Amino acid sequence: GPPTSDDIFEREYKYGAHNYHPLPVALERGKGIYLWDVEGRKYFDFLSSYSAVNQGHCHPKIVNALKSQVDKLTLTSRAFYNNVLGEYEEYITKLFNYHKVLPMNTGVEAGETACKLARKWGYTVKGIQKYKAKIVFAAGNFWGRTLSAISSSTDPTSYDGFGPFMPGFDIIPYNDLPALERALQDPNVAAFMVEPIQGEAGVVVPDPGYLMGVRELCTRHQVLFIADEIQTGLARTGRWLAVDYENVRPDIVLLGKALSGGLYPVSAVLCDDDIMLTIKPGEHGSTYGGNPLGCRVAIAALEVLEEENLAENADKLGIILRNELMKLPSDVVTAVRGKGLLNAIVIKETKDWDAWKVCLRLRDNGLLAKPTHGDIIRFAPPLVIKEDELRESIEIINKTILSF
Amino acid sequence: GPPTSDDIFEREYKYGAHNYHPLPVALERGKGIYLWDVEGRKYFDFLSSYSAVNQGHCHPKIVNALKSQVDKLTLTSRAFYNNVLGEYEEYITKLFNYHKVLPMNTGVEAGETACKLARKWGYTVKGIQKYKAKIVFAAGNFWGRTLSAISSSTDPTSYDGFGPFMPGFDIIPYNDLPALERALQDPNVAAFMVEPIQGEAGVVVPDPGYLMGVRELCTRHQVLFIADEIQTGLARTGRWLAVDYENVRPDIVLLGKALSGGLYPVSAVLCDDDIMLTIKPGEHGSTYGGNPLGCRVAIAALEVLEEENLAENADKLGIILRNELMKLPSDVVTAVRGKGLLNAIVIKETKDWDAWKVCLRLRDNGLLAKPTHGDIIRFAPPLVIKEDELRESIEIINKTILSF
Numbered sequence: 117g118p119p120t121s122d123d124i125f126e127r128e129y130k131y132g133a134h135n136y137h138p139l140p141v142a143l144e145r146g147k148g149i150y151l152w153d154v155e156g157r158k159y160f161d162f163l164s165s166y167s168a169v170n171q172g173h174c175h176p177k178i179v180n181a182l183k184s185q186v187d188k189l190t191l192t193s194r195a196f197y198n199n200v201l202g203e204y205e206e207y208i209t210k211l212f213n214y215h216k217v218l219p220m221n222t223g224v225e226a227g228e229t230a231c232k233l234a235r236k237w238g239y240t241v242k243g244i245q246k247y248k249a250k251i252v253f254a255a256g257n258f259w260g261r262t263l264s265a266i267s268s269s270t271d272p273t274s275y276d277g278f279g280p281f282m283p284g285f286d287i288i289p290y291n292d293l294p295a296l297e298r299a300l301q302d303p304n305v306a307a308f309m310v311e312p313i314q315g316e317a318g319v320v321v322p323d324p325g326y327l328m329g330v331r332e333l334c335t336r337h338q339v340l341f342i343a344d345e346i347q348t349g350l351a352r353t354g355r356w357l358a359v360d361y362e363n364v365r366p367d368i369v370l371l372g373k374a375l376s377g378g379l380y381p382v383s384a385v386l387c388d389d390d391i392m393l394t395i396k397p398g399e400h401g402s403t404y405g406g407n408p409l410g411c412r413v414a415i416a417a418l419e420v421l422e423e424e425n426l427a428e429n430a431d432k433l434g435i436i437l438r439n440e441l442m443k444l445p446s447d448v449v450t451a452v453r454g455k456g457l458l459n460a461i462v463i464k465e466t467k468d469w470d471a472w473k474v475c476l477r478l479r480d481n482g483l484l485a486k487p488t489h490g491d492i493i494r495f496a497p498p499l500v501i502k503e504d505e506l507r508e509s510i511e512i513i514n515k516t517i518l519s520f
Numbered sequence: 521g522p523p524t525s526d527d528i529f530e531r532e533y534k535y536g537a538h539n540y541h542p543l544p545v546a547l548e549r550g551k552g553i554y555l556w557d558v559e560g561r562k563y564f565d566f567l568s569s570y571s572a573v574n575q576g577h578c579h580p581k582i583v584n585a586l587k588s589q590v591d592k593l594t595l596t597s598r599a600f601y602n603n604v605l606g607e608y609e610e611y612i613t614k615l616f617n618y619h620k621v622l623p624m625n626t627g628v629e630a631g632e633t634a635c636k637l638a639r640k641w642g643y644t645v646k647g648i649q650k651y652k653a654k655i656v657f658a659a660g661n662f663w664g665r666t667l668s669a670i671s672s673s674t675d676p677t678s679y680d681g682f683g684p685f686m687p688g689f690d691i692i693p694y695n696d697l698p699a700l701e702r703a704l705q706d707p708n709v710a711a712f713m714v715e716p717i718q719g720e721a722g723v724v725v726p727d728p729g730y731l732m733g734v735r736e737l738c739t740r741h742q743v744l745f746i747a748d749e750i751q752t753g754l755a756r757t758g759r760w761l762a763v764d765y766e767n768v769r770p771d772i773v774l775l776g777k778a779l780s781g782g783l784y785p786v787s788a789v790l791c792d793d794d795i796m797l798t799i800k801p802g803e804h805g806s807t808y809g810g811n812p813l814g815c816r817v818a819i820a821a822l823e824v825l826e827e828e829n830l831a832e833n834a835d836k837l838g839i840i841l842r843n844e845l846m847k848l849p850s851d852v853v854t855a856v857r858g859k860g861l862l863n864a865i866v867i868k869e870t871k872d873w874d875a876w877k878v879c880l881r882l883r884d885n886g887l888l889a890k891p892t893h894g895d896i897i898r899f900a901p902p903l904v905i906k907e908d909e910l911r912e913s914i915e916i917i918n919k920t921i922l923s924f
């Protein structure tokens with residue numbers, strides 16, 4: 117065990133795969149909104165592990181839930197029942213007001229599950245001829261790194277080199293109701309999968325009334341509306357789900373990341389009986405999906421969000437953050453956009469700087485954030501952050517931006 | 521919170537998806553080789569969560585590793601480095617003697633990652649024209665429930681209804697070297713993915729010399745040999761990897777399940793530099809893949825396997841188990857097969873009994889096991905089980921089988 121930061125990089129370089137190019141910073145401790153590196157330096161976290169730690173790192177109540185259950189039982193597999201799962205299922209379903217939930221582990225798996233449902237329902241309920249069922253996605257979407265996920269990606273870095281692509285995936289522009297209308301003319305379309313705000317694409321927010329339109333068009337052409345809320349859901353945008361901003365009820369909602377508070381890989385797929393029960397016994401699952409340990413963390417993690425009114429906090433602090441960022445000069449920061457605490461800025465890439473360089477200097481001033489395309493820096497702190505703390509971070513941003 | 525077993529079933533029936541039909545038994549506690557239900561009844565576990573708990577449930581050293589790290593840091597995402605990952609990577613790679621490891625969460629994800637590597641290497645190193653690269657699998661294979669996984673399945677229950685399938689997946693019979701030779705005639709084949717013993721299919725063991733043949737044919741036609749050891753690896757069959765029985769070195773090995781000891785979803789993809797480095801930064805990953813918490817559990821979990829010589833235990837006890845099971849009457853138990861502590865029996869389905877009924881009666885006599893096709897019951901206890909305990913379980917098996 118080499119203790120120094122450079123030794124952590126070079127050890128991961130030798131023995132680990134080069135499938136990431138992370139911001140050079142070796143972290144050793146995390147608590148609430150703060151991260152510490154192995155030389156003891158302290159950083160505000162403005163990524164929140166793409167929203168996985170809405171509750172802040174190692175939130176005590178979520179930690180205790182984990183610590184309590186590990187001493188009892190962690191995995192039976194779903195060959196048997198465990199005592200915890202059904203309790204979790206009763207909570208999550210009643211919370212979001214859907215008949216049933218299907219538990220999975222990672223975010224991609226929730227997506228894969230939704231496509232399987234979309235398709236199954238397409239064949240069995242809609243009466244589409246077998247293996248002609250289609251799913252529409254939006255350009256800029258991101259929902260994982262499986263062969264299926266990357267088959268619906270408009271990002272060359274994701275799909276280039278990764279071999280024949282899954283058929284039945286059509287792609288239309290995001291934030292475009294005429295495009296959706298055009299596409300849903302084909303009776304073989306089963307679902308449209310879309311994010312209320314596109315995270316990985318650079319916090320792209322659609323025009324007011326987009327989600328209402330999507331809901332209305334889906335209903336009109338008998339097509340399932342799948343809301344991927346893995347990153348925008350669970351309080352970050354300032355509501356339980358980002359779709360709540362327009363009072364829209366998707367057929368299928370996907371949850372992940374914050375569902376655990378960073379303590380365990382837990383994802384969920386929420387839908388009603390007419391859709392969910394198209395999948396009979398033996399036809400879908402996952403070894404760790406619904407395990408006792410994950411479910412306990414999830415209950416705790418959801419309790420934190422509700423009882424600390426983190427949505428309401430996120431909404432109000434979001435406004436402050438954006439208003440301050442808009443005071444930066446238009447020549448340097450060309451855009452500020454977001455809902456709640458899922459915001460971003462676009463920096464003008466020039467001969468004296470880019471987003472990477474900025475993020476390096478932010479790190480040197482005690483703030484951690486990562487660029488997502490080369491001009492776009494994302495500002496997503498944990499939702500347990502308070503007004504003064506946020507105003508310290510903003511000063512760190514201003515300082516760093518104005519120093520170039 | 522209803523405390524009774526029937527209430528656990530009916531609550532999961534109402535609020536949870538119907539994608540499993542588990543053996544009616546509601547478990548609340550697990551430790552070593554034992555599981556306890558909510559009415560306080562005690563059961564030997566002869567499934568080991570399909571090999572996830574090789575180390576027994578809640579093994580103290582693995583528990584402590586989890587308990588220690590949760591208080592420190594659990595998830596930064598791979599936008600940054602953490603202090604733990606590279607330590608894990610140095611251990612796992614040196615243990616199995618491969619240059620690099622790519623960390624993922626669930627078993628399916630390791631599979632998906634291997635195909636992506638197989639393909640990428642096919643295009644970039646082998647020079648296959650883009651999107652003609654093929655992967656061969658074996659009939660009866662099982663490696664997850666993604667659209668890709670089920671696209672290579674010969675099981676109707678897995679693929680029927682799940683919409684157009686991934687191209688470039690050819691399927692040949694298992695345990696058939698002439699079939700493999702035939703298939704690898706096509707220069708566009710990139711990899712052959714196969715299990716040393718097929719778990720989900722009903723513990724199907726190939727003839728001695730199959731894996732040597734597979735290794736020799738793969739090498740001859742410049743095709744990657746991908747060994748899925750998610751279930752057979754990590755001591756269960758009586759070796760570090762089941763492939764070790766024939767001293768064969770696959771190009772890519774997949775690990776999972778026992779890599780954590782049931783305490784966390786951790787999978788790994790192990791290969792050398794010429795294959796691994798075909799994937800550049802930004803082109804593959806996973807939110808929870810390589811997280812500090814999972815890596816700490818994994819180190820601990822691998823330490824238990826080595827320092828408690830569980831392979832050596834598994835091998836010896838395996839022999840006893842099989843020898844005893846073969847003494848059962850041929851009229852009832854038509855086959856016994858396995859390596860180490862991954863065994864199974866086939867029951868003759870008749871009007872007086874089947875595998876399901878048997879497993880119900882085993883439950884009533886304090887043993888837990890599930891059938892995998894309707895005639896096949898799997899016997900896979902945790903590897904920390906000792907000779908007397910195993911001989912108590914055997915008496916439970918004999919008793920139950922002879923009572924019909």
Ligand SMILES: Cc1[nH+]cc(COP(=O)(O)O)c(C[NH2+][C@H]2C[C@@H](C(=O)[O-])CC2C=O)c1[O-]
Binds near residue numbers: 222225258260372806
């Ligand atoms: C809306 C939505 N839908 C599904 C998923 C799949 O989630 P998962 O990783 O658990 O399979 C995600 C995960 N988003 C990630 C993962 C990440 C990495 O480091 O690989 C980069 C990144 C940026 O957004 C998601 O944002």
Ligand SMILES: Cc1[nH+]cc(COP(=O)(O)O)c(C[NH2+][C@H]2C[C@@H](C(=O)[O-])C[C@H]2C=O)c1[O-]
Binds near residue numbers: 400629715
């Ligand atoms: C060799 C190998 N390779 C990949 C995977 C997928 O891994 P994972 O589920 O972790 O994603 C598995 C999973 N084995 C399981 C999971 C299960 C269910 O409930 O669906 C049926 C069962 C029987 O063995 C595997 O044995």
